């Protein structure tokens, strides 16, 4: 399949060089996968989700997202336009509050969550989490995320903004899940981007077109834009055949465009999202 005049990040991970504007994808797109999104919310009613998403989990008083952080991750995941899995399903669960805080407690809880409810959910090509969000060191957050990871969740976890090494963030710098920089469209290193040994990947994440609150669009920028870039890459490749929540993330890194990125540090990953699709 062709999206043509598709948002720069789409176009980016389904091309070798910058500066297209066509993202090409493989027409199963992530049938039959799940994507978590652990963040604010989503505003599930957005005509861009098609009815693909539903909240499953809030811990406020409501499970709509107030912020629209957590609507943007969403539908960079698998929204009909903006979004790498366009026919993924999308679950909420809603960990940050609607200035897009959240306890590092109700978020280990958000995981746990993840790990159990995925068995009420039909899943039969397999099952992801994104979550773009985190703060300062914490081994608790990490062995939820590891936990997550082993139940059997491909997990997407960003790397942080704050340019410096992600080994001082959480879930960030948790080993066994797959940590994601932010790029820019001239693939250079996003400014805000931490960087580090934990990275495993990196993803489109300055100026990402993407869903937003009130069946509206914006453009943003984060570490929490590229994460979900991965997300759904994840849930396309589960769902083509070609990787498992296990294997994902290191199978992204296998094939990935290697060495094309500007301004990485020496010790952090050069390696840029891409799903070689070949139409």
């Avoid at 996968?33 to 409501?62: L, N």
């Avoid at 509050?97 to 090509?125: E, H, L, W």
């Amino acid at each position: 399949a062709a999206q043509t005049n598709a948002p720069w990040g789409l176009a980016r991970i389904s091309s070798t060089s910058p500066g297209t504007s066509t993202y090409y994808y493989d027409e199963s797109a992530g049938q039959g996968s799940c994507v978590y999104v652990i963040d604010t919310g989503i505003e599930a009613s957005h005509p861009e989700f098609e009815g693909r998403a539903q909240m499953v989990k809030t811990y406020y008083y409501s499970s709509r997202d107030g912020n629209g952080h957590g609507t943007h991750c969403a539908g960079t995941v698998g929204s009909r336009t903006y979004g790498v899995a366009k026919k993924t399903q999308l679950f909420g669960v809603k960990v940050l509050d609607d200035n897009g805080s959240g306890q590092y407690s109700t978020i280990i809880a958000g995981m746990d969550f993840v790990a159990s409810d995925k068995n009420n959910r039909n899943c039969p090509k397999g099952v992801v989490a994104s979550l773009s969000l985190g703060g300062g060191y914490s081994s608790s957050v990490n062995s939820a995320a590891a936990r997550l990871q082993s139940s059997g969740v491909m997990v997407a976890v960003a790397a942080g903004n704050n340019n410096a090494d992600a080994r001082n963030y959480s879930p960030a710098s948790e080993p066994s899940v797959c940590t994601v920089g932010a790029s820019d469209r001239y693939d250079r290193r996003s400014s805000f981007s931490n960087y580090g040994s934990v990275l495993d990947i990196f993803g489109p994440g300055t100026d990402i077109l993407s869903t937003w609150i009130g069946g509206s669009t914006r453009s943003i920028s984060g570490t929490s834009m590229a994460t979900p870039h991965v997300a759904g890459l994840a849930a396309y490749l589960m769902t083509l055949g070609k990787t498992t929540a296990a294997s994902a993330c290191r199978y992204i890194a296998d094939t990935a465009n290697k060495g094309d990125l500007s301004n990485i540090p020496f010790g952090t990953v050069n390696l840029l999202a891409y799903n070689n699709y070949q139409a």
